[PDB]
C-alpha cells in the first residue's frame, strides 16, 4: 500500500549510514530517504521524478526485450534479416543496418517530441497540475483506488531494479561475450 | 546578493531578472560600465546573425543554387567562389537594412533616443507571430537561447573548418584527428 | 601572547585565529606587511594545485589513457608542450583564472572568503561544524601535498624512478 512511515514518507531510511535529508518532502512515490549528495535541495523534484520514471520504464522494457532476444524467442521471419545469433550488441547493429531501429527511433522520438516535451513543460511550469510519469495510460484499468501506491511504489522499485539489472547484464555480456541465460 | 550563474561572485547591479536570459551572469562588469540596452541590442544582433550563419553553414553543404560558383560544400570556399558583385550587393543591402530598420538612429548616442524603442525590438513581425501576451517572455527566452547557442556553434564551426578543411557534416562523417 | 605552534616566538598580531589552520606560524612576518586575504587565497590555490598534482602522479602512473603514449609525468610535461595538450590545459586554467581574478577582487572588497568558490555540488558540508572541520582538513592536506609534490618531482629527478617503484626497492 502507501505505507507512509513504513515504506515511504518522512522518517524512512533504507540505508541509515546516510541520514535522510530534510529536503525530501515524502510526497513523491519511492521516497525512502536516500539522497546522500543532497540533490533534492536544489533540483526541481518533478523533473527528476519524471526522469526516474522514464529511465525505469525504459529499463523494464529493455530487460524484457534483452531476455526474450537472448534466450531465443523471436517473431516470425525476424531471425533472417537480423541474424540467427543471440548476441544483443550484434542484434542492435544488425537491426540498425536493416532499418528496424531507425523506425523505432523515429516513432519513439515522434512520441517524445509531440507529447512528452509538452507534458514535461506544462508539469514544470504549473499549468496542468500533472504528476510525474502520469501520461493517463490505463487501457486495461488496473489502478483506480489502489493508485496511491502498490501500483506507483512497485512501478518505481521495479524500474530501479530493472535499471541495475540491464546495466549489469550489458556489462556482463561485454566482459563474458555471452548473453544472459 | 550573489550571482546565480556564478555563485562565488556578487550579483551584478543593473541585472535584476527583468530581461530574458538573465541569470545574473556578468563577471567582468560590462553592465556596470555600459548601458544594458545597447548590450542587449548587440547580443540579439550577434545571436541572430549567428542563427542565420550556423543554419547556412549546415544547409549550404547539403543544398546549393545551380552553377559552378555556388558548388562549394565548405562555407569558407563558398565565400571566395561566389560571384563578387553578388556579395558586394549583400553588403550594400545589409547596410541599407541596418540604416532603415534602426530609423536613422544607428549609434551609441542616438539609438534609443526615442523612449519607446526597446532593445532588439526593431518592429519586425512580418507574420505577426507575437500576438500572444503570456507567450512573449518564453518567446524572448527561446530567441536569446537560440542566439547564444548559435554564436557558440558558428564560432566553433568556422574554426573547425579552418583546422580540418572540411565542411561540418562531412567532417563529422570523415573525421580525422589532429 | 606567544605562538601556539612555536612557543618561543611571539604570536603575529594579524594571526588572531580567524582563518582555519592558524597556529601562529609566521616568523618572517609576511602577514605584518602583506594582506592576509591574498596570502590565504594564494595558499589554498597553491595547495589545491599540489593536491591534484600528487593524485595525478599516483593515478597517471598507475593508469594511462589508451589514446596517449606511455611516459613518465615529468617527461609528459615536455611531450605535451609539443603535442598541444599542455597548451589546452594552460588555456583553460587561464580562462578560469580570469574569473579567479574577479573572485580575488571580490575577496579584497570583503564580499568573499579567501577560499570560497561556492563549489560544493555533492553537498558534503551540511552544517557549520562540518564546514570548519573540512576546512582544517583541506588546509592541512594543502600544505602536506605542497611538500609532497616537491618531494615527488625532486626524487624523480635524482633517482629517475616514480614513487611507487621507489617504494618497492629503497
Amino acid at each position: 500500500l502507501y505505507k507512509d512511515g513504513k515504506m515511504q514518507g518522512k522518517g524512512v531510511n533504507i540505508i541509515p549510514v546516510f541520514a535522510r535529508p530534510d529536503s525530501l518532502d515524502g510526497t513523491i512515490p519511492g521516497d525512502q530517504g536516500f539522497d546522500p549528495f543532497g540533490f533534492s535541495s536544489w533540483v526541481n523534484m518533478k523533473f527528476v521524478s519524471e526522469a526516474e520514471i522514464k529511465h525505469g520504464r525504459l529499463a523494464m522494457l529493455a530487460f524484457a526485450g534483452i531476455m526474450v532476444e537472448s534466450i531465443g524467442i523471436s517473431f516470425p521471419g525476424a531471425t533472417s534479416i537480423l541474424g540467427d545469433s543471440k548476441d544483443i550488441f550484434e542484434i542492435h547493429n544488425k537491426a540498425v543496418e536493416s532499418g528496424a531501429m531507425g523506425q523505432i527511433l523515429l516513432w519513439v522520438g515522434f512520441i517524445e517530441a509531440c507529447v512528452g516535451v509538452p507534458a514535461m513543460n506544462e508539469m514544470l511550469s504549473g499549468e496542468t497540475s500533472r504528476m510525474p510519469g502520469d501520461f493517463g495510460f490505463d487501457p486495461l484499468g488496473l489502478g483506480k483506488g489502489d493508485k496511491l501506491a502498490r501500483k506507483q511504489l512497485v512501478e518505481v522499485t521495479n524500474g530501479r531494479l530493472a535499471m541495475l539489472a540491464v546495466s549489469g547484464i550489458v556489462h556482463h555480456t561485454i566482459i563474458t561475450g555471452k548473453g544472459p541465460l | 546578493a550573489k550571482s546565480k550563474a556564478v555563485p562565488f561572485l556578487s550579483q551584478p547591479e543593473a541585472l535584476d531578472g527583468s530581461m530574458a536570459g538573465d541569470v545574473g551572469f556578468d563577471p567582468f562588469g560590462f553592465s556596470s560600465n555600459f548601458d544594458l540596452k545597447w548590450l542587449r541590442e548587440a547580443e540579439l544582433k550577434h545571436g541572430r546573425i549567428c542563427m542565420l550563419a550556423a543554419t547556412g553553414c549546415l544547409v549550404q553543404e547539403v543544398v546549393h543554387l545551380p552553377g559552378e560558383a555556388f558548388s562549394q560544400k565548405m562555407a569558407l570556399n563558398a565565400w571566395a567562389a561566389a560571384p563578387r558583385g553578388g556579395m558586394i550587393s549583400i553588403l550594400v543591402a545589409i547596410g541599407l537594412i541596418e540604416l532603415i530598420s534602426n530609423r536613422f538612429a544607428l549609434t551609441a548616442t542616438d539609438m534609443f533616443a526615442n523612449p519607446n524603442r526597446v532593445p532588439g525590438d526593431l518592429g519586425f513581425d512580418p507574420l505577426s507571430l507575437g500576438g500572444n501576451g503570456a507567450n512573449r517572455a518564453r518567446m524572448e527566452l527561446a530567441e536569446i537561447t537560440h542566439g547564444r547557442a548559435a554564436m557558440m556553434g558558428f564560432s566553433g564551426m568556422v574554426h573547425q573548418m579552418l583546422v580540418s578543411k572540411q565542411a561540418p557534416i562531412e567532417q563529422l562523417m570523415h573525421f580525422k584527428a589532429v | 601572547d606567544f605562538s601556539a605552534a612555536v612557543p618561543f616566538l611571539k604570536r603575529p598580531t594579524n594571526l588572531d585565529g580567524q582563518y582555519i589552520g592558524d597556529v601562529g606560524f609566521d616568523p618572517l612576518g609576511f602577514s605584518d606587511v602583506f594582506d592576509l586575504r591574498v596570502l590565504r587565497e594564494a595558499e589554498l590555490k597553491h595547495g589545491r594545485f599540489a593536491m591534484l598534482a600528487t593524485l595525478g602522479f599516483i593515478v597517471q602512473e598507475l593508469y594511462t589513457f589508451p589514446f596517449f603514449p606511455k611516459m613518465a609525468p615529468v617527461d609528459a610535461h615536455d611531450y605535451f608542450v609539443k603535442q598541444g595538450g599542455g597548451s589546452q590545459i594552460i588555456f583553460w586554467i587561464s580562462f578560469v583564472e580570469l574569473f579567479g581574478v574577479v573572485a580575488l577582487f571580490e575577496t579584497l572588497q570583503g564580499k568573499r572568503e579567501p577560499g570560497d568558490f561556492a563549489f560544493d555540488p555533492l553537498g558534503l558540508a551540511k552544517d557549520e561544524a562540518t564546514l570548519e572541520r573540512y576546512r582544517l582538513a583541506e588546509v592541512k592536506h594543502a600544505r602536506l601535498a605542497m611538500i609532497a609534490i616537491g618531494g615527488f618531482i625532486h626524487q624523480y629527478w635524482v633517482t629517475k624512478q616514480t614513487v611507487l617503484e621507489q617504494l618497492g626497492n629503497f
Binding site: 547493429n93 | 562531412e170 570523415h174 | 589514446f67
Partner: peptide, 25 residues
C-alpha cells in the same frame, strides 16, 4: 556519403568511430 553513424568499415570514419577507436587502443 551512404554510410552509417557508427561501425563503418571502408572510406567512412565518423566522429563516433574516432571516439570508439580512441577508447579501444
Amino acid at each position: 556519403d551512404g554510410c552509417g553513424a557508427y561501425a563503418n568499415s571502408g572510406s567512412c570514419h565518423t566522429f563516433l568511430d574516432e571516439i570508439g577507436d580512441a577508447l579501444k587502443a
